[PDB]
């Protein structure tokens, strides 16, 4: 979709074969995968985590520092 | 006795293909508007239900026995 006017506008208005948008029928969702990414990295570089515990590998004050690092 | 979904049921069952029903209804609306104007301005009086003819072939409407009162 080129032109810059925008798409999905319900107002008064084309290529021969437009491209289908992206969709996901059912699954975990990005809102979960993105949040789990950091814990996944910590698990990767920490060597391994024993059964019955995971996720809480960085204290609340260190996750903010890591995110700032990434953005910068 | 009489609900409000009789004529719609009849004309939905008369047209197996939906394109035909869509076009029929689209023409029927305009024809009814024209007939309404004609009947309203000239003071036609006894508009019994057997005086409205509907052409199933296209959608035209002809109101027979139209005489001013």
């Amino acid at each position: 979709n080129i032109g810059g006017a925008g798409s999905g506008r319900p107002t008064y208005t084309q290529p021969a074969l437009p491209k289908t948008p992206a969709f996901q029928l059912e699954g975990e969702g990005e809102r979960v995968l993105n949040k789990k990414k950091l814990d996944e990295l910590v698990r990767q570089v920490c060597g391994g985590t024993a059964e019955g515990q995971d996720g809480n590998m960085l204290t609340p004050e260190v996750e903010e520092s890591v995110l700032n690092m990434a953005d910068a | 006795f009489v609900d409000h979904t009789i004529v719609l049921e009849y004309f939905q069952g008369a047209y197996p293909n939906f394109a035909d029903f869509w076009l029929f209804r689209r023409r029927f609306s305009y024809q009814l508007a024209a007939l309404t104007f004609m009947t309203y301005t000239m003071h036609i009086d006894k508009r019994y239900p057997h005086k409205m003819n509907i052409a199933r072939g296209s959608g035209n409407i002809w109101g027979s026995e139209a005489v001013s009162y």
Binding site: L41, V42, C46, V66, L67, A70 | -
Partner: protein, 81 residues
């Protein structure tokens, strides 16, 4: 420095979109291909690259960011465990 601290294409309407997307710290989501792709264009327009960027740059940038974070975290862990 003090001022900062105090036909044709309008190149200044696409640079301003840089601030629309929330930062990683603001949301809590580790940056991914989508966020980096959104962030790429304003920088290119600022520097004068009218054409844009190559199609396969977002994945490269995401991989580089992941590698950098992994290296830093590995460095911190080795000296205290």
């Amino acid at each position: 420095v003090l001022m900062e601290h105090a036909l044709k294409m309008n190149f200044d309407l696409e640079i301003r979109k840089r601030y629309a997307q929330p930062l990683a710290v603001e949301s809590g989501e580790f940056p991914d291909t989508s966020n980096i792709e959104s962030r790429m264009l304003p920088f290119c327009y600022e520097a004068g690259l009218s054409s844009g960027h190559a199609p396969d740059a977002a994945q490269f940038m995401s991989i580089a960011t992941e590698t950098f974070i992994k290296e830093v975290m590995s460095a911190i862990f080795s000296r205290t465990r």
